[PDB]
Write a protein that binds this DNA or RNA. Structure first.
Lengths: 41, 184, 57, 62, 313, 132
RNA sequence: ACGAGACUCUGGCAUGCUAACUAGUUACGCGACCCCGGUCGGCGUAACUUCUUAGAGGGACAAGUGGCGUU
C-alpha cells in the first residue's frame, strides 16, 4: 500500500513527498492609486 | 629569499627550449624548499604543469610496487642525487635537471591510425615522458648493482644534460624518434 | 593560522593582510584546511575503487 | 632540413583509433601567416609550442 | 551649482557591502557591514593611493550582516544579521559586549535611540522587537504588525515625539508610538515591496523606497503623502543630508541626489570606467551614508567596494 | 553533470508566473522568497529552485521567455506594439505599377489615378530555376 | 505516473548557537628538575568551549565574472 499524506500523522505520515513543491496561492489585493494615511487612537 | 634544500638557488637556471617554458615549472613561484607538497595537482587537467619538476621527479621515482607511498625515500634520493650532480659537474643541478628534461623528451612519437603513423608529442607529454625515461634510467641501472640510486639518478641526469647516449633516457628517446622517422 | 589570528585581534588588518598574502601566495595549504579524507572501502574489492581479480574460464 | 617551432592557435577535435591524438592548427613562429593542421599525441591547450622535426607533412582534417 | 567626483575606493571586502553607518564624532572612521560576516572599522588616512585602510574586522556572525549602526558615543556599534542575531560590538577591543537572542529568521534592520537605550530590529519573521542593551524583550509586536518582512526600521531624532518608522514587504510604511508600542498611523498607497525608509534630522518627514522607484515623503506630525519622486530604477537605500536639504538615493547601479525644496535632479553619481560593457549588469549599489559634515558620502556596491563621493564646489 | 530536472524547472516557472513582483537578480533573497511563498520540503531543492529562478529572472530582464506568463505582457508587447510612425509606408506619393494591373484597374472604376507611375514593361521572360 | 533526480546516511566548513569531573583547554596556585624563564599526560581549583563530543541551524545554486550555443 502507498499511504496518503495528512499533517495529523494518523492515516499517513506528516511529511510530504520530497518532490512535492506546494506553492501557496497569492491572495489578490487592489494595487492602490491613492496615497491614504489611516491615523487612529 | 634563498631556496631549494637551503642551498640550490632558482635565479641561476635558464629554460633553453621555449617549447617546454611553461611545462618545466622551476622558476620564482615554483621555487619550493622541499619537493614535497599536498598539491592536489592531479585534480583538473593541466594543473600537473604547475608542479615543480623536482616534485614530479620525486613522485615519478617511487615505483615498482614496494616503493609506492615512500616519497621521503625519494625526496632523500633526489637530495643526495643533486649533491652528486653538483660535486661531479660544479653546477646548480636544477639546470642539469632542466637540461635533461629538454634533451631527454621525445619530440615526435608513433601512434596507431596498417602500421603506426608518426605524430608530434604535446610539450606536457614530452615533460611526462622525459621524467619517466630518466627515472626508469635510474632504477633499472641501480637494480642488482653495488651503486645507489643517488649515483644512478645523478649519472642519468648528467648523461641526459649532455646527450651522451650512455643515458638510458636519451637512447630510448632517439630510438622512439627513429621509429617515428620510419613511419613518415 | 594562529599568527594570522594574532595579527587580526591585537594589531591592524594591514599587518595581518600582508602576512596572509605572503602565506597564501606561496602555498594555499598554509591557511586552508585540505578537505581530503581516506575514502571508505566497499565489498567486492581490497579497497575504495580497486576490485578483486575477475576469473573467466 | 631544420626543426621548426609552431604555436597551437586552435585545437580542432580528436583523431586516432582510441581517440589518442588531438588534431590542431599550428601558427609557425617564423612565418606568422602559415597555419597548418597537425596531429598531436598527448594533452594540449591553446597557445603551447610544438617542435616539428619537419613542417612538410600535414594531417588530414577529421 | 556643483558636480560630485571620486577621491578613491575602499578595497578589503570579499562579500559585497550592506548598510554603511557613519558617525558624528570621528570623521576618519567609517564602519561598514558586508555579505561576508566581517564588519570593517575603517581608517580614513585620505592618502594618495587609498582614501581608507581597514583597522578592525568585527568578526563573528553565522550568515550575512544585514544592517550595522554606531552609537552617539562612538565606542559601541550594533549589527543585525541573517542568522537572526543582533550583536553589541565593543568597538575599542573589537569583541562583543552582549548579544540579543529571540528572533526566528533573518534580522534585516537595526537602529538606536538618541539615548542609545532602546534598540529595534526588523526581521522576516513578521515582527519588530524593542530591546534593552541587556538583551531583554521589553516588548514585541504581533497584534497588528507588518504582515510581511521589515526591510527597515528607523527612529525620529525628536524626544517630544517618541515615534519610530518601519517600511516592509507588505507595501506599507507603518509609524509606531514608541511609548504605547502599537501603530500610530499607516501610509497605504505605495505599490510593490519596500527596501528602505529614512527619517530626516528634524524628525518631521521620512522617505520610503522599493522596487517601483517611487520615493515617497511622509510627514510624522500629521501623516500626509507630500509628493512622489520617479527614481526610474530600483531604490535600495535612501539617505538625507545632515546639514543640507538634500536626499541621496541608491537607485540601481547609480545614486540620484534630490533637493527636496526644488524637486529637480541635482546630479546622478555613477562609475566612469564601465568594463561591464558587453552584456553584463554594472556593479549595483545597495547602501550609502553622508559623513558627519556632509562633504563625503560613502556608498557600498555589489562589487564589494565602498565608493566615496566628494562635493567639488 | 548539472542539468536541472522538471520538478526544479516547473516549480521555478510557476513561482515566477505567480510571484514575479517579489523576485530579482539576487540568489540569497530569491532563496528566502521561495521559503515564504512555497513549502519546498528540502534545502537542496530550495536552492536548485531559487537558482533556476535567478537564471530565468536574468532571461526575463532580456527579451521574452517561451514557457512563462506574467501580469503586463510585458510593456514591450502591450505598450510598444502601439508604435505607429508619422505617415504609413502605404502613403507612397509615386506607386510603382506594371501595365497589366493598370489593364485590370482600367476594367474597374479606377481607370486613372494621379499617383500611379506605370513602368516600361519587363522584357525577356526568364524567371524559372534551371533543372538539375 | 514509476524508474533518474529528489531522498536517507555519510565526507568536508563554521572562534556563530546550546552544552559538559565518563571530554578537555587557558589561567592561577602547590610541587619535581635545569641556569628570571624553560619542561611536566605531576597535583589541585577559577574561568571558558578553540581543539572534544552531538544537537539545532546556516552553507553551494553553475550563485558571480569571461568565452563558443535562438545566447
Amino acid at each position: 500500500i502507498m499511504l496518503p499524506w495528512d499533517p495529523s500523522g494518523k492515516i499517513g505520515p506528516k511529511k510530504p513527498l520530497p518532490d512535492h513543491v506546494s506553492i501557496v496561492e497569492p491572495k489578490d489585493e487592489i494595487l492602490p492609486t491613492t496615497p491614504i494615511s489611516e491615523q487612529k487612537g | 629569499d634563498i631556496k631549494l634544500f637551503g642551498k640550490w638557488s632558482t635565479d641561476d637556471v635558464q629554460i633553453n627550449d621555449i617549447s617546454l617554458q611553461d611545462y618545466i615549472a622551476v622558476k620564482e613561484k615554483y621555487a619550493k624548499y622541499l619537493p614535497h607538497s599536498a598539491g592536489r595537482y592531479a585534480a583538473k587537467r593541466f594543473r600537473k604543469a604547475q608542479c615543480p619538476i623536482v616534485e614530479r621527479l620525486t613522485n615519478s621515482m617511487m615505483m615498482h610496487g614496494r616503493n609506492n607511498g615512500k616519497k621521503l625515500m625519494t625526496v632523500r634520493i633526489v637530495k643526495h642525487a643533486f649533491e652528486i650532480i653538483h660535486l661531479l659537474t660544479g653546477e646548480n643541478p636544477l639546470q642539469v635537471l632542466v637540461n635533461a628534461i629538454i634533451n631527454s623528451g621525445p619530440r615526435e612519437d608513433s601512434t596507431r591510425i596498417v602500421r603506426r603513423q608518426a605524430v608530434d608529442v604535446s610539450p606536457l607529454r614530452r615533460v611526462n615522458q622525459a621524467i619517466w625515461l630518466l627515472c626508469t634510467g635510474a632504477r633499472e641501472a641501480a637494480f642488482r648493482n653495488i651503486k645507489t640510486i643517488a649515483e644512478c639518478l645523478a649519472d642519468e641526469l648528467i648523461n641526459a644534460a649532455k646527450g651522451s647516449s650512455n643515458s638510458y633516457a636519451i637512447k630510448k628517446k632517439d630510438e622512439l624518434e627513429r621509429v617515428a622517422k620510419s613511419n613518415r | 593560522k594562529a599568527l594570522v589570528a594574532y595579527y587580526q585581534k591585537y594589531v591592524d588588518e594591514a599587518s595581518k593582510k600582508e602576512i596572509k598574502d605572503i602565506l597564501i601566495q606561496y602555498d594555499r595549504t598554509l591557511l586552508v584546511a585540505d578537505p581530503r579524507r581516506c575514502e571508505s572501502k566497499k565489498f567486492g574489492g581490497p579497497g575504495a575503487r580497486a576490485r578483486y581479480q575477475k576469473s573467466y574460464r | 632540413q631544420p626543426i621548426k617551432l609552431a604555436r597551437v592557435t586552435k585545437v580542432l577535435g580528436r583523431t586516432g583509433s582510441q581517440g589518442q591524438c588531438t588534431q590542431v592548427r599550428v601558427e609557425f613562429m617564423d612565418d606568422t601567416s602559415r597555419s597548418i593542421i597537425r596531429n598531436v599525441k598527448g594533452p594540449v591547450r591553446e597557445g603551447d609550442v610544438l617542435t616539428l622535426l619537419e613542417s612538410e607533412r600535414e594531417a588530414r582534417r577529421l | 551649482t556643483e558636480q560630485m567626483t571620486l577621491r578613491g575606493t575602499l578595497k578589503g571586502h570579499n562579500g559585497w557591502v550592506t548598510q554603511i553607518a557613519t558617525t558624528p564624532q570621528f570623521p576618519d572612521m567609517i564602519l561598514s557591514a558586508s555579505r561576508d560576516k566581517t564588519i570593517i572599522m575603517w581608517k580614513l588616512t585620505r592618502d594618495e593611493t587609498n582614501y581608507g585602510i581597514p583597522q578592525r574586522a568585527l568578526r563573528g556572525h553565522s550568515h550575512f550582516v544585514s544592517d550595522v549602526v554606531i552609537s552617539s558615543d562612538g565606542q559601541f556599534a550594533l549589527s543585525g544579521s541573517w542568522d537572526g542575531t543582533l550583536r553589541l560590538w565593543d568597538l575599542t577591543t573589537g569583541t562583543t559586549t552582549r548579544r540579543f537572542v529571540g528572533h526566528t529568521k533573518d534580522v534585516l534592520s537595526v537602529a538606536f535611540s538618541s539615548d542609545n537605550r532602546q534598540i529595534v530590529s526588523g526581521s522576516r519573521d513578521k515582527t519588530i522587537k524593542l530591546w534593552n542593551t541587556l538583551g531583554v524583550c521589553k516588548y514585541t509586536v504581533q497584534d497588528e504588525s507588518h504582515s510581511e518582512w521589515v526591510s527597515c526600521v528607523r527612529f525620529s531624532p525628536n524626544s517630544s515625539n517618541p515615534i519610530i518608522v518601519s517600511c516592509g514587504w507588505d507595501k506599507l510604511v507603518k509609524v509606531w508610538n514608541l511609548a504605547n508600542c502599537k501603530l500610530k498611523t499607516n501610509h497605504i498607497g505605495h505599490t510593490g515591496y519596500l527596501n528602505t525608509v529614512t527619517v530626516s534630522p528634524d524628525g518631521s518627514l521620512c522617505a520610503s523606497g522599493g522596487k517601483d522607484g517611487q520615493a515617497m515623503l511622509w510627514d510624522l506630525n500629521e501623516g500626509k503623502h507630500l509628493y512622489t519622486l520617479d527614481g526610474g530604477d530600483i531604490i535600495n537605500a535612501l539617505c538625507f543630508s545632515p546639514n543640507r536639504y538634500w536626499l541621496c538615493a541608491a537607485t540601481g547601479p547609480s545614486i540620484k541626489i534630490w533637493d527636496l525644496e526644488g524637486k529637480i535632479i541635482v546630479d546622478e553619481l555613477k562609475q566612469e570606467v564601465i568594463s561591464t560593457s558587453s552584456k553584463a549588469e554594472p556593479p549595483q549599489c545597495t547602501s550609502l551614508a553622508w559623513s558627519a559634515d556632509g562633504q563625503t558620502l560613502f556608498a557600498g556596491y555589489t562589487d564589494n567596494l565602498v565608493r566615496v563621493w566628494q562635493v567639488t564646489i | 553533470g548539472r542539468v536541472r530536472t522538471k520538478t526544479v524547472k516547473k516549480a521555478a516557472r510557476v513561482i515566477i508566473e505567480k510571484y514575479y513582483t517579489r523576485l530579482g537578480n539576487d540568489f540569497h533573497t530569491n532563496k528566502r522568497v521561495c521559503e515564504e511563498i512555497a513549502i519546498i520540503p528540502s534545502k537542496k531543492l530550495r536552492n536548485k529552485i531559487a537558482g533556476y529562478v535567478t537564471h530565468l529572472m536574468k532571461r526575463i530582464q532580456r527579451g521574452p521567455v517561451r514557457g512563462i506568463s506574467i501580469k503586463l505582457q510585458e510593456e514591450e508587447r502591450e505598450r510598444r506594439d502601439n508604435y505607429v510612425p508619422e505617415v504609413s509606408a502605404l502613403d507612397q506619393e509615386i506607386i510603382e505599377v506594371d501595365p497589366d494591373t493598370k489593364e485590370m484597374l482600367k476594367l474597374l472604376d479606377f481607370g486613372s489615378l494621379s499617383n500611379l507611375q506605370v513602368t516600361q514593361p519587363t522584357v525577356g521572360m526568364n524567371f524559372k530555376t534551371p533543372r538539375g
